[PDB]
Structure formats: structure tokens, C-alpha cells
Amino acid sequence: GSLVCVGTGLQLAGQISVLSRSYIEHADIVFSLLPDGFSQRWLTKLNPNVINLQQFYAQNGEVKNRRDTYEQMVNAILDAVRAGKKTVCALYGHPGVFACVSHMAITRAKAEGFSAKMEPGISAEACLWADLGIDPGNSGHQSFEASQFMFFNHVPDPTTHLLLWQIAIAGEHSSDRLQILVEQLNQWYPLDHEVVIYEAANLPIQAPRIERLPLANLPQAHLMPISTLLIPPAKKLEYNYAILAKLGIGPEDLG
Amino acid sequence: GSLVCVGTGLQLAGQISVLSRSYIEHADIVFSLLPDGFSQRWLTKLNPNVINLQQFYAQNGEVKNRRDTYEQMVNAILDAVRAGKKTVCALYGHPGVFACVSHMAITRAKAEGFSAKMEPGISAEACLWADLGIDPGNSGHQSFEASQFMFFNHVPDPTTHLLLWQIAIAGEHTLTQFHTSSDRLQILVEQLNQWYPLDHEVVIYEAANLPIQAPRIERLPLANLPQAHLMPISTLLIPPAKKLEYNYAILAKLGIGPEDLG
Amino acid sequence: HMSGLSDFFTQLGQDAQLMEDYKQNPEAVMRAHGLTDEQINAVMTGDMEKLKTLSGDALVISHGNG
Amino acid sequence: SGLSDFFTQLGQDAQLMEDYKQNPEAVMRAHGLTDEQINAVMTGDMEKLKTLS
Ligand SMILES: Nc1ncnc2c1ncn2[C@@H]1O[C@H](CSCC[C@H](N)C(=O)O)[C@@H](O)[C@H]1O
């Protein structure tokens, strides 16, 4: 058997790649880790042989560790592959982005000598660029998981568009934690620096959340799991006179 | 008149979104910028009324500032919109990732009171994560245009993944050529060597454009970059050079210590 | 043949069933879609430039000067 | 299904999207959404939607 992990993108039905959809259609068995019921209903109609891995999560208010549950999910996927089934895993967004189970399953499938691959899909970040009309290449781009940004030393380049993901759980090992994030960011960004809270739309009738507000107000904003923080540049680009010199040119030579 | 900008991804046929494909099919006219002739054919069978934006690039020998090329592309798109055509601009990859033509056209259409929007697509970066087995969400990641990295003051975080786009024209200041030189690349190496050792392993990545093609994943020491064979389509991945460092200041505020990081 | 090549690559790019069949038996699948000997050789050697010849035939859309 | 089927069609079909954006209420009713559902969409109340189908 074999394994292919695909993503659905963010938008229902419409944002999945043509090939990725085809993979689901023609699969012997599909393991789904989809967020909502519209997504689930849609998948079931592509292929009736669907196993919802969400079932492996805690049920009836039982206690269950993430790492144990991921292991069960992965083991369930691999069992299908071992049995000889053309197995497809359908994840949300891009299947290798904020997704340990895909990576783990593919890793384990390879190690056991099975064919296994990841198909790219449209991530929340891809949606952000389109919705806000921003090119990451315009002044550069940096993305961090918000908690990682707080726990470890990651000095941003303030000429870039800075993205902080999973802002809703920033600093979890609350307005208190977000206030700490504000003070951190205030090293490089003024408190009245306009930032944007972004949430990609998941339904075609649904507008994306694009809330502009001063940095200082972030602690008092309502956040969801999908919320992301965009921090636009605080400084214009400035010439690297040293490197230009080495190149034997000046700012005037830039076409 | 209206404008929708869509991407087609990197792979032939299969990497376009279902909705994006629909947009192309229903369009009055499509302006395209695609990787190759197979893609062009595929597009034409989707919608035969295609204007190839390739034509606006400098022809053999001609000296042309790409600012002009992009300006003429945008203008061509807007002429369709202004004439009352339901216009689709179909760009390879993601129409708004290291691509100005779409953002420009949308901005202009809006300014003139037309309906305009961009649909996200699969970028070379999305492909890179998949092919290399990296989760960029958890690890973090950074992107810069190589030339912009050289000409302007950018400071990378050497603890997280660093992508340099358009490495094949790194340092080409005129915007009239479509390749750089070993000596330009050498200067980039020297610049990078502030943070990255000369023997640091880097990766020249090229996503496959055809389904029978393997991606290029060439691992080499950074010092060797100036001798490498680069394509316009090449991207440079520079993995972390330094190990993560504790944000003691912020940890203390959260009331936790390095020991608690789990 | 030139058209047939293009049509094969197009189907292969979009069709998961054909894709999985291809990966199992590349040559056999290619022959069953009417590809010639030298088309198949070019695929197997990974000679992309030959393929473009057999079908019969600048990608920067950004700058960094500001 | 209904709401699901509609949302599925809308999200995949550019022509339906076109029709939708010109007259959302009419297109939604044409596809058998209820006054409550239609209202949830036009108000942007994603929560109430979840609790409808
Ligand atoms: N197949 C591919 N593999 C790797 N990088 C690629 C690529 N195609 C484009 N790129 C990157 O993109 C640059 C061209 S700019 C076009 C970007 C395109 N819209 C996208 O979303 O990918 C190249 O110089 C390279 O840095």
C-alpha cells in the first residue's frame, strides 16, 4: 500500500488542488483531520470510506495527552498502509504546516519501506497575502509561532512584515500574556503602531477577519485559535552602502 | 469589467485550486504568466482567449528595465478591464507572492472603481515545505528577495529557516539581465558569513513543473554557492546556523523558566 | 505525438489514479498512452529539454530595488 | 444537507459565486436556505450558522 497526505486549504470545497481532490476520490481509505462539519460532509461525499481521526481525541470529557493521541492516529493510518490500502490523509490548509501527524506518519511509512508523500496545499499564510494584498517579497517576511517568539530570542527585522501565529495561546507553557507580548514588541514597534488581527475565512459566504488596531489595544481583543497577528514594517528600507560599494555601484545605479 | 488574479501553482494542471480553475474557465479573457509550453497548452484548453504576458519581457538582445515590463503587463490587464471584460490574470504559483503585477493591477482597478480580488495559490515555498519535510509553522521561517537582501539593510534570524528568492539574479542591479555572476554571488556569501559558517549546508531548491520530474534538492556548503548552476526558478534555503536561545526576559515575566519549556 | 505528449502530462498532473499507476509501472503506463520510444527514454533519463523539443516549442515577476 | 450542499457548490463554482454576489438573498433562497439561515449569512453570525445545519 501507500500514503499520500493532502490539504483542503482554508475555504470549503474550492481551495483544494485539483490533484489533491483526485487523490481523495480514488483512495481506498481516507483519514480526515478536518475542523468543521461542512468540511466533513464534503469529504464524505468525495469518498464514503472515511475515518475521522478526530475520534481519537478525548471523548465524553475524558483525560488524554496529545502525544498519546497523535500516536494512535498515526498507528491507525499506518495499519491501513500495512494492510495494503491506498491510504490518503486529508488535513486542513497545507498538510505539513502546523501538522505533526502527517510528518510522523510519512516518516514512519518511509522507514517501513512504503511509498509516502506530502502534497502541498493553501495555508493560512497564503490566504493572508491575498486578502491583505501584501507581497512578502516587498520588504521581506518573517513568521514565528507566537509562543516560540516569547520563549526564545527571535529579534525581528522591522523592515519586514512580521507574522505571529497562534496569537490566542501566546505564552502558554489572556490579556496578561498579550500585554507581555505588547511590551516585548514595544522594543521595536511604537505602541500606536497599527497591527492587523487576521483570520482566514473557511466558508464562501464568510468575510475574513481583518481588524486594524494599535498595538497597545491587542490585550483587549477577542481571539480565536485561527487568529494571526500581522505587524507591518516600522522602518523603511535603507541602502546597504557597504555591499553596494563592494558591488562597485551606488543608489543611483539601481534601476 | 472586473479582475480576478489566480495562481496555477508549480506543477502542471494538478496544483491549481478547483475554484481558481473555474475562474479561468468562465473568464472573458486570461492574461497568463506560466512556466512552460505544457502549461500554456493546458491553459489554452481551459480558456482559448489567452494573452501571454511573456511577450512584455525583453526580447533577445533588447535592453529593458523590468519596471517597464511590469508596468506594461499591468496596463494590458487594465485595458481589458476598462473595455468591460471579465478579466482573469493567471500567474504561476501564488499570484501575490514575489509577484507585483497582480497587486499593482488590483490596486489600480480598485482606484478606478472596478471590482478586483486575488485568490491564493500554491507557492514555491508551499512546495518546498512539502518536499523537504519541514513544518514551517512550528519552526518559523523568513523570506527575502536575494538582491533586496544585498542592496538594503536586512538582518536575518540565524535560528530559523531563511529563504532567499530569485538567487539567480542576486546582485543584478540594472534589472535588465536575467542572471547574475559568480562574483556577485561571492559577495552574497561574504554578507551571509556574518551569521552562517562558510561550510554551513544550504539547499538549492527547484519545485518540479512536470509530474514526471523530480524536484531539485541540491545540498552544498555555502562557500560553493558561487560555483553552482542556478535557474531563474531557483530558491535558496539556509537552515538555522545557531541553536535556539532562551528569552530570559520574557520567560521571567511569564513566571516560568527554561526548565518548564514543555 | 507532440499533442499526445502534452495531453498525457496534463492528465497525469491532475489524475491521481493515473498518477499511482504511473509510479507503479512508468514505462507500461506511458506506452498505454501512446508515447514513443524516445519520449519514454527522455522521461526516464529526465531530459526535460528533449521533452520540450518533442512537444515542439523568463519567470521573474518581482524586483528588489525598492 | 442543503446548507452544506449549497456552500459546497458556491465554493467551487465561479459562475455561482458571480450570481451569488449580485443578489445573495435570492440565490440562497433559490437553493433552499431558510430565512433564519439567510439572516445568519447576511448578518455574518457564523455561530448561529453552526446551530442551523
Ligand atoms: N519551481 C520553483 N522552485 C523553487 N523556487 C521557485 C520555483 N518557481 C519559482 N520560484 C521562486 O520564485 C522566484 C520567481 S518570482 C514568482 C513567484 C511565484 N508567484 C510563486 O509563488 O512561487 C524564483 O526566482 C524562485 O525564488
Automatic annotation (TrEMBL), chain A:
This is TP-methylase family protein. InterPro entries: 4pyrrol_Mease, 4pyrrol_Methylase_sf, 4pyrrole_Mease_sub1. Keywords: Metal-binding, S-adenosyl-L-methionine, Zinc. S-adenosyl-L-homocysteine binds at residues 94, 124, 166, 200, 225, 227-228. Zn(2+) binds at residues 125, 141. The keyword S-adenosyl-L-methionine applies. It comes from the Bacteria. GO terms for molecular function: metal ion binding; methyltransferase activity.
UniProtKB/TrEMBL annotation, chain D:
Residues 4-52 form the Extradiol ring-cleavage dioxygenase LigAB LigA subunit domain. It comes from Shewanella oneidensis (strain ATCC 700550 / JCM 31522 / CIP 106686 / LMG 19005 / NCIMB 14063 / MR-1). The chain holds residues 2 to 54 of 71 of the full protein. This is Extradiol ring-cleavage dioxygenase LigAB LigA subunit domain-containing protein.
